[PDB]
Symmetry: C2
Subunit: 220 residues, 2 copies
């Protein structure tokens, strides 16, 4: 028996957890699991201090005292409003992405400038309404309403309605991907549970995602 | 026309902003606007600190130095999975809400335990997975995968697909609502702008939401 305190990114929680919860019930029976959503900073801080046992993140921790393991890769996809000129195109054209109509998550897209081609593109901050601290939910709602463009995680596609799927435009190759990883402290003394968790989370997604597929590139 | 810093709760943003942005662009041309999503605690402190000028919250500030104006009332609705006993019912029923399969938002549903019935319901924590500080999006996805019950704000409905609309269950009267309000420093110096934002934000939602209708009760 025992208890497990695990954090999860807001840009992962909605897409991954629906898949994992049923799997935990059957495999992790006898264990009380406390799930919490945090952004990366909180995750790394909580891991170190011992506030949480594990953290599901979208990047390497690269933090003294912590370590992480690959769970799966996940492509970023264009979510393009029906009002954008780019809607008539089949793929996202970097050079046609209008900086003034782009919604970027500070940490979802621009954690250490991951999608740098957009995070640091000229004209980005030139618009009436600046949006900071925004959520994927908000951004998608905006796009669906005909305002702008944003980027959504592959795992969310199967959750999308027929109408929503129409807004999806993948990238031209190479396609941007983030890495979803399970982070802990180096001295984490539950190696067997850790091992079990890694397996369960990885089994929560299609195996194809376990490895970088030709045509995909880790966004840096 | 100047700069305006305005914060909005994560539980309101995705539902209100797509409505207002189109309005602000026409009516507030020339004014620089910086929107950021914040929780109620940060909104209040940021108002008192000057970091932000306005905050769209879901409660009365009830804080020395701050005041606020009503924008509109918004119903909480049941969001029930197809697997749940309640699914065959027409409306949410206190007694028949299984605390072990309920997803509640820290501030979204239990700000000062606004929804006391559920926020303080026996067994709410008797589960395998305690979900801390989850997002509305995550809870909605969990419900859509046949996992549990949550409550969502009325303004979300119009955004839902047909399928998602099948999961909606209204409360029996009195139906619980929250109040969405605009909060400012009592000494805020831009009065005309304040009055303009109050009118504009109220024009962003159906006028029937401006007042508390029959069968509705301000949750507390």
């Amino acid at each position: 028996t025992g208890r497990l305190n695990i954090a999860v990114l807001p840009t992962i929680a909605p897409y991954l957890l629906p898949r994992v919860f049923p799997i935990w019930k059957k495999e992790l029976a006898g264990l009380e699991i406390h799930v919490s959503e945090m952004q990366t900073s909180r995750c790394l801080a909580s891991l170190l201090s011992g506030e949480i046992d594990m953290a599901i993140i979208a990047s390497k921790a690269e933090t003294e005292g912590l370590e992480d393991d690959l769970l799966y890769y996940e492509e970023f996809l264009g979510y393009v409003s029906r009002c954008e000129p780019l809607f008539e195109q089949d793929v996202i054209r970097t050079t046609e992405v209008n900086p003034h109509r782009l919604w970027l998550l500070d940490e979802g897209h621009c954690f250490r400038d991951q999608l740098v081609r957009f995070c640091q593109m000229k004209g980005l901050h030139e618009r009436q309404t600046a949006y900071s601290g925004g959520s994927m939910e908000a951004f998608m709602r905006l796009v669906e309403s005909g305002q702008g463009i944003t980027f959504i995680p592959q795992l969310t596609v199967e959750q999308l309605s027929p109408s929503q799927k129409e807004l999806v435009r993948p990238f031209g190759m190479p396609r941007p991907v983030r890495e979803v990883r399970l982070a802990v402290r180096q001295d984490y003394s539950r190696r067997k549970l850790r091992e079990q968790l890694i397996g369960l989370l990885r089994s929560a997604v299609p195996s194809d995602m376990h490895k970088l597929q030709t045509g995909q590139h880790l966004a840096h």
